[PDB]
Design a protein around this ligand. Structure first.
Ligand SMILES: CC(C)(C)S(=O)(=O)C[C@H](C1CC1)N1C(=O)[C@@H](CC(=O)O)O[C@H](c2cccc(Cl)c2)[C@H]1c1ccc(Cl)cc1
Length: 88
């Protein structure tokens, strides 16, 4: 995963936007750096993470389509996030 990916510009779909709005200011266009931080912050503030995030109990699970995932499998995380946004 190249660092340049963090600079890419994206627009979250409605359910992802709902999640992001609980940790950051609403924007019409975000960088992937922003999306990753806000999602990460959401997970930490809600203590869904202690390397496993448990989200069967949360909107995040509905967004990702999984009951849990590892914080270390970055490829899979990127793929899960991208189902929930549109590139601009
Ligand atoms: C402290 C923080 C800045 C808020 S954070 O680093 O984002 C916290 C979250 C963790 C889920 C709660 N998080 C991490 O702890 C670490 C884990 C690691 O070292 O590999 O980085 C995660 C990360 C960062 C960038 C890209 C990806 Cl795909 C994952 C990264 C992570 C981000 C987003 C998701 Cl969906 C999952 C993990």
């Amino acid at each position: 995963i190249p660092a340049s990916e963090q600079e890419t510009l994206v627009r979250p779909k409605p359910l992802l936007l709902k999640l992001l709005k609980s940790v950051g200011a609403q924007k019409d266009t975000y960088t992937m750096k922003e999306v990753l931080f806000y999602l990460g912050q959401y997970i930490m503030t809600k203590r869904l993470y202690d390397h496993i995030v448990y989200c069967s109990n949360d909107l995040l699970g509905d967004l990702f389509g999984v009951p849990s995932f590892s914080v270390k499998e970055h490829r899979k995380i990127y793929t899960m996030i991208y189902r929930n946004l549109v590139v601009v």
